[PDB]
């Protein structure tokens, strides 16, 4: 299902057995769908014959490359099946080894006879704020089955097995996103795209000519200053970690689904690493950081035939610089860094700048979910959580 009426007509054999609300039910309650089980299965779940569990050591360069290759060739595509994500090995270490990562949560599936990696799912620890509750959860990401093993019910085994391994660590709630509709979305978001290199975006058919426009007029439409306007703007440095933590923590209080990051987590997620994560702060006249913007790097391979370099807005905190100016500088910085497109969701306060800043709304939805938690749904503007 891609919309909820698609999901209105479908049977959920696996998800009906899971502690998540039914799609049809209207939810007002707050808390777990079920009580925690205090004795947990020690044995890993049975895979189909010919397949075996292997926890992937991503500190081993060969195993990280095995994982990269699986995701490069089998992970999320667009709705039109024209572009596939091209996660780099250094991005995967960033996304998969934040503070608190556990090796048993890098859960791969291999072919027994050849040891070929054919499946994967991951959990990372995350302190999550949902409405008035702050709880330790896991973020689930990179669920992936090889194309040659699709529609053999392997995905429910991966979900059950990462659940069991998370339960063993005493965690009973999880958060995750998906482009398909399942029981049951807590929030719904849409991707918006801001062209920065419109010629390239049209040759690879990511974008197309508006009616009677011309490349020369479209390039004119999306032109940017190429030197940012805000004074005091500069890359984040080690000395900025405490204030960036401070700024983010207070900014996120206005949203209903937010992460709660320690100072070490703020360092991991925001300290710049070239081709992975970019963060820029705005220092004022008296030397105090008052704003910062962030976006991460995720290229997309062109499926028909190298890649489209895409920036994704991460967390943007404004206390003195107007958010529109802050995001305008982010577009400039992305274009100086060679990015062809700048993506962002309609969550947090992004709606206040998306149209003004020439973003075009894209196709497909991004659903947010909680596992084993009852809460009312919320609008995109209330979601304050971005996952990689």
Ligand X SMILES: CCCCCCCCCCCCCC(=O)SCCNC(=O)CCNC(=O)[C@H](O)C(C)(C)COP(=O)(O)OP(=O)(O)OC[C@H]1O[C@@H](n2cnc3c(N)ncnc32)[C@H](O)[C@@H]1OP(=O)(O)O
Residue 124 near ligand X by CB under 6 A: no
Q: With left for phi above 0 and alpha for psi between -120 and 50, is residue 144 left, alpha or beta?
A: beta
Q: How far is the CB of 318 from ligand X (least distance, A)?
A: 30
| CA dist 192 → 130, 133, 311, 346 (Å) | 25, 30, 12, 7
Residue 236 near ligand X by CB under 6 A: no
Residue 216 near ligand X by CB under 6 A: no
- Cβ atoms of residues 120 and 142 within 8 Å: yes
Stretch that binds ligand X, among 79-87, 170-178, 197-205, 302-310 (CB under 6 A): 170-178
Residue 174 near ligand X by CB under 6 A: yes
Residue 28 near ligand X by CB under 6 A: no
Stretch that binds ligand X, among 50-58, 161-169, 308-316, 338-346 (CB under 6 A): 161-169
Q: How far is the CB of 136 from ligand X (least distance, A)?
A: 11
Q: What angle do CA 35, 107, 98 make, to 5 degrees?
A: 85
Say whether 142 counts as a known binding-site residue.
Answer: yes
Q: With left for phi above 0 and alpha for psi between -120 and 50, is residue 29 left, alpha or beta?
A: beta
Q: Is the dihedral of CA 262, 266, 269, 273 positive or negative?
A: negative
**Looking at beta carbons only, is 130 or 143 nearer to ligand X?**
143
Say whether 224 counts as a known binding-site residue.
Answer: no
Say whether 281 counts as a known binding-site residue.
Answer: no
Residue 7 near ligand X by CB under 6 A: no
**Looking at beta carbons only, is 13 or 286 nearer to ligand X?**
13
> For residue 262, how many C-alpha atoms fall within 13 Å in the half-sphere facing its CB?
10
Residue 154 near ligand X by CB under 6 A: yes
Question: Of the candidates 23, 128, 182, 266, which one interacts with ligand X according to CB under 6 A?
Answer: 182
Residue 166 near ligand X by CB under 6 A: yes
Question: Of the candidates 76, 82, 204, 243, which one interacts with ligand X according to CB under 6 A?
Answer: 76
Say whether 91 counts as a known binding-site residue.
Answer: no
Task: Compute and round to an integer the Cα radius of gyration of the chain.
Answer: 21
Say whether 18 counts as a known binding-site residue.
Answer: no
Say whether 359 counts as a known binding-site residue.
Answer: no
| CA dist 279 → 51, 114, 173, 264, 341 (Å) | 42, 42, 30, 16, 17
Burial 315-352 (b: 16+ CB within 10 A, else e): bbbbeebebebbbbbbbbbbbeeebbbbbbbbbbbbee
Residue 96 near ligand X by CB under 6 A: no
The token pair that represents 378 in the structure block: 């919320």
Question: Of the candidates 193, 371, 374, 380, which one interacts with ligand X according to CB under 6 A?
Answer: 371
Number of chain positions touching ligand X (CB under 6 A): 35
Say whether 210 counts as a known binding-site residue.
Answer: no
Q: What is the rounded CA–CA span in Å between residue 295 and residue 157?
A: 34
Question: Of the candidates 115, 150, 220, 250, which one interacts with ligand X according to CB under 6 A?
Answer: 150
- Cβ atoms of residues 384 and 257 within 8 Å: yes
Q: What is the rounded CA–CA span in Å between residue 364 and residue 20?
A: 23
Q: How far is the CB of 178 from ligand X (least distance, A)?
A: 4
Say whether 375 counts as a known binding-site residue.
Answer: no
Question: Of the candidates 87, 142, 270, 315, which one interacts with ligand X according to CB under 6 A?
Answer: 142
Residue 163 near ligand X by CB under 6 A: yes
Q: How many CB atoms lie under 10 A from the CB of residue 135?
A: 16
The token pair that represents 136 in the structure block: 């330790």
Residue 12 near ligand X by CB under 6 A: yes
Residue 324 near ligand X by CB under 6 A: no
Residues of the shown chain interacting with ligand X in the complex, contacts defined by CB under 6 A? 12-15, 74-76, 138, 140-145, 150-156, 159, 162-163, 166, 171-174, 176, 178, 180, 182, 371-372
Q: Binding site: which residues?
A: 13-15, 142-145, 151, 153-155
């Amino acid at each position: 299902a891609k919309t909820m009426e698609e999901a209105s007509k479908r049977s959920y054999q696996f998800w009906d057995t899971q502690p998540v609300p039914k799609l049809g039910e209207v939810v007002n309650t707050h808390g777990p769908v079920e009580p925690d089980k205090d004795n947990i299965r020690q044995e890993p779940y049975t895979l189909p014959q010919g397949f075996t569990w292997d926890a992937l050591d991503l500190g081993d360069r060969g195993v990280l490359k095995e994982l990269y290759t699986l995701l490069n060739e089998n992970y999320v595509e667009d709705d039109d099946n024209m572009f596939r994500f091209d996660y780099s090995p250094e991005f995967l270490l960033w996304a998969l080894r934040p503070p608190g990562w556990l090796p048993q949560w890098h859960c791969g599936v291999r072919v027994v006879s050849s040891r070929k990696l054919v499946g994967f799912i991951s959990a990372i620890p995350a302190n999550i704020h949902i409405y008035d509750t702050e709880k330790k959860m896991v973020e689930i990401n990179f669920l992936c089955v090889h194309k040659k093993l699709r529609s053999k019910r392997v995905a429910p085994v991966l979900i059950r097995e990462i659940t069991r391994r998370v339960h063993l660590e005493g965690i009973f709630q999880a958060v995750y996103t998906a482009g398909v509709v399942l029981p049951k979305p807590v929030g719904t978001c849409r991707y918006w795209h801001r062209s920065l290199n419109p010629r390239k975006l049209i040759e690879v058919k990511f974008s197309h000519l508006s009616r009677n426009m011309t490349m020369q007029r479209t390039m004119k439409l999306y032109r940017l200053p190429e030197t940012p306007k805000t004074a005091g703007l500069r890359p984040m440095e080690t000395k900025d970690i405490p204030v960036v933590h401070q700024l983010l923590t207070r900014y996120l209080k206005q949203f209903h689904l937010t992460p709660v990051m320690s100072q070490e987590e703020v360092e991991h997620w925001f300290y710049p690493q070239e081709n992975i994560i970019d963060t820029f702060v705005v220092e004022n006249a008296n030397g105090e950081v008052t704003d910062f913007l962030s976006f991460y790097t995720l290229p997309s391979t062109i499926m028909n035939h190298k890649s489209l370099k895409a920036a994704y807005s991460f967390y943007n905190v404004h206390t003195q610089t107007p958010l529109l100016d802050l995001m305008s500088d982010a577009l400039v910085l992305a274009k100086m860094k060679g990015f062809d497109v700048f993506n962002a969701l309609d969550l947090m306060e992004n709606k206040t700048f998306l149209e003004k800043l020439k973003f075009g709304i894209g196709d497909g939805n991004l659903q947010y979910y909680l596992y084993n938690w009852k809460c009312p749904s919320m609008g995109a503007e209330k979601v304050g959580l971005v996952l990689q």
